[PDB]
DNA sequence: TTTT
DNA sequence: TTTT
């Protein structure tokens, strides 16, 4: 099409939890909580949310941990921008029972727009999506829930860009189509109007500014269901990166099961398994493997990451590695439910970048709703060399150990390692 | 199509190499000399042999084993039988070298019909299937090439079916095919002559009377360009059967390699992997591997054989197991070249039997030619059941070793073992 | 946070 | 015996 000539930034944010201090130093990366009270204070026109859930104060856990005081104030900054004028749309999945939305509640009043989406009914999944619009040119996506402990206890890792309108609006394309297709008796229509089309796929990336640099960029969603003819699903742009891919693939992901799981009876899904062996096999690729272990860690994984890691060998010259990234928990964060996690799900090659919202299991790619983002930049140095970076101080971490680890040396409860 | 109202009948020959004594008795199968001898004495019209090569005599080995006597004697047969008047006819690959034919020749002087297929030109692969038609009444099918260690020093398992027409001239047509398509300058027709065309394939099996009781039988070949339209695919057989299998997939192959091998750059191919993971995930099908182990195995199959093994959960209800069947080999036997190896092809499920000629990769799948018996037998008992206990003979024999054991306390030598 |  |  034609080139966005915006002055396209991007920044790398993580949120780091408590007890989590990585000894190197020069991260240097905004926290979530940071870049998310920026582009709120920086909100004058519009604001796009969509969201799994919504748990910020205290009361929605019913815990005192004072930890949550920064998801506590992000609150207050979403209840003052509602009345200044700015449209706030937020989509959020319903709860399957009848859970308070505490939180939804007050942004009603505020004046906010909240549209629950009742994704079991259409296409049997959630809306486990996590991505901001902020006045159609800044956006963030990444692992980040509207959770107080996504910002304080869970690990994280997202990317916002800025002075991208483009790209921007084209994330907005994808909120739209969950806001029409979750208002009230909807079904997904047979053909999508020329709204939500889009013509910024993996065939045709669009051509941005990144960072003075130039750089090809796409969004890739899920479900096959709700993507227009243009939208690239996001099964098929994972693979190509991982296809593409010819001298290392680094990937973070919390949960990796080659599986449509939780759709009893048990059914396999080889899609990404048999890419990564085609990749390790057939070329020379160094494939590492980064996943991350806590209680509500499913064991049948373990099984699968083991099947993964025997594929090395000098004769096959393949180099698969695999790790488990548990984040430690003393006994007063261990009291916090579904805190102490590492949600980053991210992959770098040497000449790509992906950045998603969801975990690699079937459900995430035929049924659950997810969005990531794919970038390539030609040159050394750039967004893939910090999200890179930012990987490999991961891998190199204390927190990262072998399938083999005893259970008990772990900081945390971890389901994927036999005890002694 | 019509029943063959013939009094079917089915024998389970295998050659026990010296050395190698099951304790179990009731073994009561025929060696492959044995039924071979009795084909060939009772062979007055025809005779169609297809063997991947010919070494028979101690000559063409430059050995001096009097172990050789049987294959010899079989040479004998094979010289006496052409002048009485019987149409012997031989398709062997094309050896790549000028490797010399003595067996050959001497069946040449004898009066028989030697048409050498060179393989390498039209598919680039090779002839390695093992069949005989004898009278178009019996035939054999099995694992044994026409050498006279195949006889004494390899282990083997084949199907030798009495008293069946319609099936051997099944067989036929399939010799046929490779009869005309290897005697000079032939190609591959786009379309097969109606002379080759079955209509006895996966889908409409024939109805044989085996040993009194109906069964459903039908044979399948490799590869696709050499298949008519009626011939049902040898992996697309082994697939089905594999598919259909509900409560245990016992499996005894020579070689297990997940790739389309010796085919520079390295090739994936998941075609039966996935096949047996679906099987032993989705289903609680106990899933056992027997490969047999020896000098010439290559060792890049050991890694892919241990990313079967991990997936045995009980969360996964996975039961798969390998094992590694390893003939030992004192100081003597050890001189004879390609000589002490377990060459059993074959598939048993709790509903269906599987006798092939060709080991389960991607050339044998692919490129390389081959041929296989799939029987479907109603009620207890029959071949199913005497396959079975061949199987369970085998497995738990003290030849058969799992893959963590040293190598040293194998008898021969074995590059899929560690040592210490 | 998607897993009890 | 298909693998050097
Ligand atoms: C493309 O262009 C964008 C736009 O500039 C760049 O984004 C900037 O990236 C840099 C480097 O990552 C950011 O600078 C870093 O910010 C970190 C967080 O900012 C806060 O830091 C403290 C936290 O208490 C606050 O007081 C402060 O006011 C900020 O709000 C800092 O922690 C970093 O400092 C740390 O690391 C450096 C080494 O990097 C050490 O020397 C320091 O001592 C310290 O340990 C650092 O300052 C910058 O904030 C980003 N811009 C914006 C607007 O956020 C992209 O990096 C660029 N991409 C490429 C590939 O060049
Ligand atoms: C369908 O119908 C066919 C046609 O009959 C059956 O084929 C017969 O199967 C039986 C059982 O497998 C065969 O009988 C066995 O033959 C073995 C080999 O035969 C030779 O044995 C010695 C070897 O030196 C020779 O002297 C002899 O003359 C034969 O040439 C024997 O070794 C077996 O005996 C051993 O096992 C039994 C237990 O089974 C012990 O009791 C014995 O002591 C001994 O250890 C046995 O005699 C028979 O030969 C087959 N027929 C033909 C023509 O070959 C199929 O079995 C049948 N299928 C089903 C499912 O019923
Ligand atoms: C996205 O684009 C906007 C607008 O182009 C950027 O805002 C600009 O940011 C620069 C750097 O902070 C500002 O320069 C500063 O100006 C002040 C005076 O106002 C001066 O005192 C400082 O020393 C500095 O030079 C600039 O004014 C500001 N422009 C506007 C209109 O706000 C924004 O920085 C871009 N996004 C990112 C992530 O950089
Ligand atoms: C395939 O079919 C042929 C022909 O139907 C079978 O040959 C038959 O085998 C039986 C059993 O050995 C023979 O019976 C025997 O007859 C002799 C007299 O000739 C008798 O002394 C024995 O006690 C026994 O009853 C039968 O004669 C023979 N028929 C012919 C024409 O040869 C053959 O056995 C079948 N194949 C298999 C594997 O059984
Ligand atoms: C969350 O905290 C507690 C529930 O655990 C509640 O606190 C109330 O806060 C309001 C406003 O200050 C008071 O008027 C009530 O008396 C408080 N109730 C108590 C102490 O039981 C309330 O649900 C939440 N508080 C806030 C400030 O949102
Ligand atoms: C070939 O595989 C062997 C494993 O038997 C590698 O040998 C050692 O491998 C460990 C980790 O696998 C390293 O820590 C050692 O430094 C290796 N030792 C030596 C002498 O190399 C060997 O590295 C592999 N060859 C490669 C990867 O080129
Ligand atoms: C195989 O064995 C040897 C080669 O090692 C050869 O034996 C010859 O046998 C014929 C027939 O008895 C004799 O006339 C020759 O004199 C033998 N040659 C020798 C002993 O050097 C021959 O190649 C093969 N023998 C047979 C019987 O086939
Ligand atoms: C569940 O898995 C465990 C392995 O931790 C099995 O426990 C033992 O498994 C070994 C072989 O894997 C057997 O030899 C033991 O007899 C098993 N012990 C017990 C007490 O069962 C266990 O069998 C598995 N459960 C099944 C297969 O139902």
Redesign the pocket.
Same mark, same amino acid.
Request: glycine content about 6%; hydrophobic content about 30%.
């Given at each position: 099409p034609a080139p966005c000539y915006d002055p396209c930034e991007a920044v790398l944010v993580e949120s780091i939890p408590e007890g989590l201090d990585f000894p190197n130093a020069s991260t240097g990366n905004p926290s979530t909580s940071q870049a998310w009270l920026g582009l709120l204070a920086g909100a004058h026109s519009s604001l796009d949310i969509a969201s /799994? $859930?919504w748990?910020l104060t205290n009361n929605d856990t019913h815990t005192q941990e004072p930890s949550a005081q920064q998801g506590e104030e992000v609150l207050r900054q979403l209840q003052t921008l509602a009345p200044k004028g700015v449209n706030v749309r937020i989509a959020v999945s319903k709860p399957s029972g009848p859970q308070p939305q505490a939180d939804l509640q007050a942004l009603l009043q505020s004046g906010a727009q909240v549209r629950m989406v009742d994704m079991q009914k259409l296409t049997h999944? +959630?809306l *486990?999506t996590?991505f901001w619009v902020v006045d159609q040119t800044h956006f963030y996506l990444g692992?980040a829930?509207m959770?107080w402990?996504?910002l304080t206890q869970?690990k994280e890792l997202g990317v916002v860009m800025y002075n991208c309108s483009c790209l921007a609006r084209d994330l907005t394309k994808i909120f739209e189509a969950y806001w029409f297709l979750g208002q009230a008796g909807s079904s997904i229509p047979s053909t999508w109007p020329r709204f939500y089309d889009t013509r910024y796929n993996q065939e045709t990336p669009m051509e941005i500014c990144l960072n003075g640099t130039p750089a090809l960029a796409y969004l890739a969603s899920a479900p096959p269901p709700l993507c227009p003819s243009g939208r690239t699903p996001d099964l098929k742009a994972l693979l190509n990166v991982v296809d593409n891919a010819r001298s290392f693939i680094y990937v973070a992901v919390? &949960?990796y099961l080659p599986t449509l @799981? /939780?759709s009893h009876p048990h059914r396999f899904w080889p899609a990404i398994d048999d890419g990564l062996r085609r990749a390790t096999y057939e070329r020379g690729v160094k494939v590492r493997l980064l996943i991350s272990c806590?209680?509500? !860690? @499913?064991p049948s994984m373990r099984a699968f990451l083991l099947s993964l890691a025997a594929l090395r060998d000098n004769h096959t010259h393949s180099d698969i590695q695999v790790k488990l990234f548990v984040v430690p928990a003393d006994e007063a964060q261990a009291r916090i439910? $579904? *805190?102490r +996690?590492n *949600?980053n799900?991210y992959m770098v090659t040497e000449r790509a970048t992906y950045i998603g919202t !969801? &975990?690699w299991?079937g459900? $995430?790619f035929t @049924?659950?709703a997810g969005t990531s983002l794919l970038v390539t930049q030609n040159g050394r140095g750039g967004l893939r060399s910090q999200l890179e970076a930012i990987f490999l101080r991961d891998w190199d971490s204390p927190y990262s150990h072998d399938l083999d680890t005893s259970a008990d040396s772990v900081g945390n409860a971890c389901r994927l390692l036999l005890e002694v």
């Open positions: /799994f $859930y748990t999944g +959630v *486990a996590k692992s829930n959770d402990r996504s869970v919390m &949960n @799981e /939780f806590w209680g509500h !860690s @499913e439910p $579904y *805190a +996690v *949600a799900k !969801s &975990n299991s459900n $995430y @049924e659950t």
